[model samples]
Target: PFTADKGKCGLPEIFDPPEELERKVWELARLVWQSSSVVFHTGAGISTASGIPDFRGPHGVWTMEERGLAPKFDTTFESARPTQTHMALVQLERVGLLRFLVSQNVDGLHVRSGFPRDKLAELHGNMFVEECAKCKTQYVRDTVVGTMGLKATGRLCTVACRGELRDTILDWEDSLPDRDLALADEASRNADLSITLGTSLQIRPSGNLPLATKRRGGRLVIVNLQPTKHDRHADLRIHGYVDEVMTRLMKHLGLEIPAWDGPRVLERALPPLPRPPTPKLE
Candidate 1:
């Protein structure tokens, strides 16, 4: 539900958040502030603020719960980049309080929002990169254009390396990258508090991180409009739109969230993107 007045449930007369849950979001923020190192684990909900269509929400890509489309992958998800939630993390990183970020989204928002590479673990892989199939060398994909624009002319492999360059994201057939899994494991294990925003938590790999963090005794705060399997496991649970709640919580934390006027998702900071090139296009 998209609300005109922030924080209020945007559903038109059908749904509303309970009083206790509303108050708890701020409490969660305060708890986050008190933690030594805070890590944010995110999914599609956070991006809706920036105007991207989520896959499972009312206006999401998959409209019916009975039958929904596959989660947008490499090409489709990369069509958009960092949203307000993305910028929020960027601000958190800039202020030096945010530690590592673990994301299940392959959209590449966290990185585009300017969080440092070493500090981020894109568990689902990032669309803004290309990797060598053999040597595993990686490079950013900021230079190429899509089919409507000019085609890429670079070699799939560096002349010296001679390894194929593949999209740096996990396709349906691909398994989670071990290195990314290790980072997710480490970040969650070491964080003082971990916040999950907009994820279903039913999915694996992404689900494993928070469990790892909780087992190590870190506080877990879960924020999502719908109930997740992790609801009972969370130290605090918040239900409602992610952009709305995060916007409100950021204000209460005395932090000034950057403004983007058009739509939460379309704020200048979060723009749509195109896919990287392959050897075939060169």
Candidate 2:
């Protein structure tokens, strides 16, 4: 009954009723608790709660642009904080429940939330990060990197060799980083459960990465308000806000959702992340 232009990035938005959502989330909780190896894939939808707008949602910026309307965001990337879902992921990793994370966001919230850097991959690059071209040192600034498409920010690296610091954010023409690709793909293939939060799964490789789990005899769970590219393949599909689902799921897991106190900076070098679980199909 609701008719709206989706634009090219558009997908149908549907909200499950509160009662139905509670029922579905309970099932999701059970599935998650039983999973020994878990991988999470995140997208723009999860950050919407933090005042960032997603691209393909009904009121997303790109959707508004289709009608020739200018779009305004509630907050700048500098002031925005990570949402409940982001904090929850941090806690999950500490508890050793979340095996790996693959994100398509450039928001930098995941890293700012103190989620371990080595355990996660930002396939889309991060807006707040700059990397040295020669020594490959990384810097996460308190402010936005102020550039896009991996250009130099006119700052020299603090690391040896004094290479210019380049923004890690990917431009349209850039390809996915090789290290991120290999790690995400292998994690997906080795996971017993792969969960996607707040993503439409439209983009390549990142979207299709979940399939590696499903094909390897693992389960897939997708949580988004709109139809995703892999709806029919999901073991459980919940159409609700990512924050709400994560809250309830955490409760069911007998864990509390950690609060977002403030931004944090992790150590420059992190220990290697835990290895993937024994494969379901191996």
Candidate 3:
């Protein structure tokens, strides 16, 4: 019957005309150049390009569920490849523009993209990582854990302690992993710049942690299709797709956005990107 939820329907996403969108990207790359420390806050919107739907987006999983509608996918957690945004972040870190990354996403794409583990704080826990309950060692598994909310995965640790392994996904009302949040908090407080990508900024801690930089006189930039909860506080409020916006910023900064399991896609749109045999093997 298509009866939708009466309360709290998601915000319909918006966009900027292409010309304004492209022009607005200039300042973003400039911020990357001037900032000493940059922290990135990622959300499910970034993973949508990898075939995952955000919980609160226009057509998100929860968003649609609220409307008595439903959906499906093309990629599993185990098979999903990191998207261009994830790859872009990797190159940003490689070039020293990105200092730390805090993600509210459980997809594990950031780690899958080869973004350094020490630099990333997965606030919501990941589907592909199991933690030892006794010693708290994280095992990055090739397969997605079959359970959530820190439940025992019926697996034993390989170490001498042989602690019981538990899945890392956090259910609603679950407290965030302490060490992850603490490190993310410290990094955000120390950041000279913060960038919010594809998040509504509605959730606590991860969504609002960027304010530490903003409150301390550092600039904060936001890129999203919907107006985020913190949009008013952002130094630059960019209304655009994160993937395209990042691609534009990468080129302006003379960076290449790597392809998923393929040779990097060099945007010749930038000079000095002469086609130099980049078709490397996986």
Candidate 4:
């Protein structure tokens, strides 16, 4: 396991993998391009550039660890915005090959990063939105106001009901959100290529996709700085800064890249990005 000593900025510095890993990663990326629909499944690692910490990495949830928050259960994402990694997936959406993105992160970066509210499944739930415990209606965080600025920001009372709000995020003992589960299930079932990035794939339902793809005869690929149990099931496995690979792959795919060099090991290769899925909307 590679762990980083905290630097002056309260986060780990950027990490670039060894040559062998990069080589194998590119091989997998080429395989990804072979499919018409490539779905990128991601976690906190995807958003490190925006400076949000991953819940499980070196810089991840360090606040929780240092503050003695229960390690097994914690949900705070209202303040975290979409980082570059989240934006990278949004960029993929522009390319038309990203079929679906199923995420385990509760940080709300994917939706904030601009994935269509209908196209993505935040399997773990999100902080920027509220869910009606009774009806499961999702309310935008901004609509409620004052709940989007915490180190852990997404949970509070429901904006619509003023009732005690259970965050859309999954807590221990909480059942997975049915809609999110179904959406993820459908995406995994149909994805020509499934990508597991910056996550352990240790949890359920979310963890099931790699095996689900194999059971149904689809390809599974893992991209993380650390190895995961799913690596055994992956057709290709990559270890390194996710953004570097995404930048290169985006370039290869002929997408306009952007500048987002931040800690968390991503490489930005382009100038900027568009705000929404305008291309797909067309």
Candidate 5:
């Protein structure tokens, strides 16, 4: 059972709409793929397949909290592997189908899945990353930061201009990082389509960022099993497992979701894409 501010509620494991609705989702997804630019907005639901628990699912952390029961994890944060959806996004970015990614998850799966840092904005901060408070140098570790709310990590910067290191996790009231916000904002505005996966679009700022594309007359497509705060605003809403939808999408796009062996860093080193050829005058 789920509990909202309104009252108690019950949501199924997955929404699984009619077969016709499924076909409609694929159609809209294909339309976005043909568009000039596509940006991805993700949330915790995408990482649940990697053994992490989501916040508002049928057996989610918040759902359990409402019943005074503790939520559990099948794998440690360090042991969790990237899911099919993560790898698919990597392939999409590599092929230039995905322009940018804005994530509200702190699980670090996006970075771990080999997505380029320059093309991604982690609005909620990451568990495996820390920063030098003075020099602003970031460090990605194999283990968790061991703290939240940007607290000191009992470590100092190794650079010549050294300073204390702190965890990058943002608590309830902490403001989103300016650099990440700017990147997400710009990408959303520049995008021809904004595709949200696994998020309910409840959290502010990060949740509202997808609206930037809609406000600019671009498209907004949401792919989540649960009803989101912005469901009414979506041009298309697909209710199904993210992996299933992504698999079908990749198949439709004639692409393969690559396998992940270990952690990787995809720096923005690819050359600028060539412009489409202009037709000659008749």
Candidate 6:
């Protein structure tokens, strides 16, 4: 197994498989372009290129912590920019190829990339958001929350029903937020295809979400250089750099990946979630 010390940034072993993998990637592109409802599940690997370290890779933060060393950060959470993969996802959603996204990363790059909040579920939480403990209103910020695991951030919600505000980041053993999980579940169950990017699928619930599509006779695709826990269940698995893979996939789908215009929270409020299918009157 690859370890943090063995790799530069806790990256898995270098992977360059036979032409079969290339063919599989092309096939994945076709599936993505044609799928009716595609949901994306993202992880730390997606932001590695953006200078943020992941948790389980060879040089990931947790990997370093286990060795009694502090994790090195190239940039603070607020300073980091979205990688090409982030930008590509935004374009994918705009083109109606991606219907929803579920992420385990707290880096906030997805929002920074200008993806809509209504379509995304940050299962862990976003560093740039604070939530009201009582009113449950979220306040997106231009700065980091400076706290973790739902701790109060020395602020109060100004929304109609005022309440104390707490950091949105989840700590160990904290249950995932209810709203985000419900949205993620609803999207996953409705997706005709679930595409996982840059995640190892090691964590529960979030990791298990992609399987929802499979259980409904839909497709599951995994895109990661490292082997994931659910690799065997994947309809297709592609080992490659996320940005590079997204670039190729976009090209195959005849879509241009948009460049980032800098960080700005999108103004559109989360639209109402999709209601379950209505049954016909018998």
- lDDT scores of the candidates, listed in order: 0.64, 0.85, 0.82, 0.61, 0.84, 0.83
Q: Give the backbone clash total of model 6.
A: 5
Q: Each prediction's TM-score against the native?
A: 0.74, 0.90, 0.88, 0.71, 0.90, 0.88
In model 5, the runs with Cα more than 4 Å from the true position are 1-14, 269-282
Q: What would the per-residue lDDT of candidate 2 be over residues 1-282, giving only the tens digit for each residue?
A: 034433356667889999999999988877776787899999999999888888888777777777677556789988998899999998788778888999999998998888888889899999989999878888989999989988999999776378989999886668898898899999999999999999888888788998899976899999999999899999989999899999998877777767776878765335434433432331
List, residue by residue over 1-282, the lDDT tens digit for candidate 6. 233232233445557575766787788876765678999999999999878887778778877877878767788888898988999888877766788989999888898888988888999999999999998888889888889888999998887556889998887668898899999999999998999998888777889999998877889999988788898999888888888888877777777778888887774544433322322332
TM-score of 1: 0.74
* Ranking 2 against 5 by lDDT, winner: 2
lDDT of 1 by residue, 1-282 (tens): 132111211222112356765688768767765777888888877876655655556555544322434433333444555665776776666565577778887566666555667777777666666676678776666533222111232447774677656665554446687887888888889987888988767667677588777876888888887666577888887777766677777676566665433212211232222322211211
Best candidate (score: lDDT): 2
lDDT of 4 by residue, 1-282 (tens): 125432122233334447775677566657665766677788766766655566656445653565556333232344455555666676676556677778887665565555666667777666656655545455665432233222223344444454444456555556777887887887788777888887767677677775666655788888776556576888877777777777766655566654333212112223334433222211
Give the Cα RMSD of candidate 5: 4.1
TM-score of candidate 6 on Cα atoms, chains taken together: 0.88
Better lDDT candidate (1, 6): 6
Local lDDT at 99 for model 1: 77
Give the lDDT of residue 178 in candidate 2. 88
Q: What is the C-alpha RMSD, rounded to one decimal, of candidate 3?
A: 7.3
Per-residue CA lDDT of candidate 3, range 98-119, in tens? 8889999998788777777878
In model 1, the Cα lDDT at residue 144 comes to 30
Q: Please give the ranking of all candidate structures by lDDT, highest first, separated by commas.
A: 2, 5, 6, 3, 1, 4
For each of the candidates, give the backbone clash count.
7, 0, 0, 10, 0, 5
What 10-residue stretch in candidate 2 is worst by lDDT? Answer: 273-282
